[PDB]
Structure formats: structure tokens, C-alpha cells
Amino acid sequence: VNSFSGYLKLTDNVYIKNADIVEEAKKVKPTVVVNAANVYLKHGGGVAGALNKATNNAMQVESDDYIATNGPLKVGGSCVLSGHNLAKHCLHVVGPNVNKGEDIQLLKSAYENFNQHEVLLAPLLSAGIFGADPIHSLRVCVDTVRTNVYLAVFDKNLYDKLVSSFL
Ligand SMILES: CN(C(=O)[C@@]12CCC[C@@H]1C2)c1cn[nH]c1
């Protein structure tokens, strides 16, 4: 049993809810919240900007030190950093950004990072300002992630379309 409430069950391991991931993280304090990161961990907008704002910029400060030591992530890659006030840990995952011309086949590689964690609160990778089709992102998620994933979808309209169209 876990703390996650109000989710629709899509599969054995994937759950979905219309929710603000920031507000969901603040309520649940999950072991892992996933960030929709870029390779530079520059948390300007989208999910990343919202998560970072909720940490009062402490996520960005920590991320800048990580990049100064390690250099950029790979598209499809990830790193584990603090969850600050939102979670124990934040798994920063880089999905391909279609608005930069990145290979959508890298979306599967991005979701494979989730398999290193038993339970996660996450957004749909490469959705929103990353430009991918969220229906596609949900299909890749279901077909790739084997651990237990609780997806937060900010937009109610999109949530209802993801559920209604789910095979
Ligand atoms: C990425 N990077 C580094 O690899 C070095 C460069 C000289 C100082 C340390 C480790 C860096 C970025 N900003 N500041 C440093």
C-alpha cells in the first residue's frame, strides 16, 4: 500500500491523475519525483521551472554545482539529486525535445531510467514544451516502465483525452 490517492489505474504498474505535480509532491512527499529536465539542468519552464520555483531555487543551485562537476547529461539520461521540500529524491530525466529536433526513439531510453526506482511520481516525458505527442509518451511509458509509476497530468483536457484514447 502507498499514499497516492485519486489515481486511475491504467495497467498493473501505471497510474494516472489530473494533478499539478508540484502540489502532488508537496502532499505525498514521494521517495522519487521525476523532473522533465534538459541536459544543462536549466530549470526555466514547464515542469522543471515549476518544480524549481517550489524549491525556492534550491534545485537550480544544486543542479548548477552538479553540472560544474559532471558536465551535461545525455538526451535519454538522468541523474539523482535531492528532492528538497518536494520528495526524498528528484530523478532528473532528459526526454528528447522535439522543438530542438531530438530523436523521439530516445523517449524509450528516457523512460528506462524509471526502472531503477520501485515507485515514482512523474510527468509524461517529452510532453508539454518538449513538443512530443503526450498520447505517444503515455504509450512508451506503459510499454517501457515496469516499476510503479504515478503520472500527474496538469491539463484536465489532456488528462481526459489520454484516458479516453488509452488502449
Ligand atoms: C563543467 N565544469 C568542469 O568540468 C570543471 C571546469 C573548471 C572547474 C570544474 C570542473 C564547470 C562548469 N562550470 N564550472 C566548472
Extents of the domains making up the chain: 1-167
Widest pairwise Cα distance in the chain: 45
Amino acid at 14: V
CA distances from 99 to 19, 103, 132, 136, 162 (A): 25, 11, 9, 16, 22
- Which residue has cell 534545485? 59
| 151 in Cβ contact with 4 (< 8 Å) | no
What's the start-to-end Cα distance of the chain, in Å?
A: 26
What are the residue ranges of helices labelled H in 71-129?
106-112
* Solved using: X-ray
Q: Which among 89, 93, 81, 90 has a CA at the least distance from the CA of 141?
A: 93
Q: Which long-range contacts (CB under 8 A, 24 or more apart) does 97-102 make?
A: 97/38, 97/126, 97/130, 97/131, 98/126, 98/130, 98/131, 98/132, 99/129, 99/130, 99/131, 102/75
State the cell numbers at 56. 525556492
Establish whether residue 70 lines the binding site of ligand 1, counting it when its CB lies within 6 angstroms of any ligand atom.
Answer: no
User: How many helices and strands in the chain, by DSSP H and E?
Assistant: 6, 7
Q: Which among 99, 104, 101 has a CA at the least distance from the CA of 140?
A: 104
Q: Is 93 helix (H, G, I), strand (E, B) or coil?
A: strand
* 100 CB-near residues (< 8 Å, 6+ apart): none
| Bridge partners, 36 (sequence order) | 93
| 110 in Cβ contact with 76 (< 8 Å) | yes
Q: Which atom of ligand 1 is nearest to the CA of 67?
A: 1
Q: β-strand 14-18 against 148-153: which pairing, if any?
A: parallel
Ligand 1: distance of its center to the CA of 116 in Å? 28
| 59 in Cβ contact with 84 (< 8 Å) | yes
- Which residue has cell 515514482? 120
Name the closest-CA residue to atom 10, ligand 1: 69
Centre a 10 Å sphere on the Cβ of residue 48 and count the other Cβ atoms it contains: 24
Centre a 10 Å sphere on the Cβ of residue 127 and count the other Cβ atoms it contains: 25
Name the closest-CA residue to atom 7, ligand 1: 68
Q: What is the Cα Rg of the chain in Å?
A: 14
**CA-CA-CA-CA torsion sign (56, 89, 21, 47):** positive
State the cell numbers at 10. 491504467
* 3 CB-near residues (< 8 Å, 6+ apart): 28, 29, 30
Compute the distance between CA of residue 87 and CA of residue 107 in angstroms, rounded to an integer: 24
Task: State the Cα angle at 96 between 80 and 24, rounded to 5°.
Answer: 50
**CA-CA-CA-CA torsion sign (82, 34, 50, 88):** negative
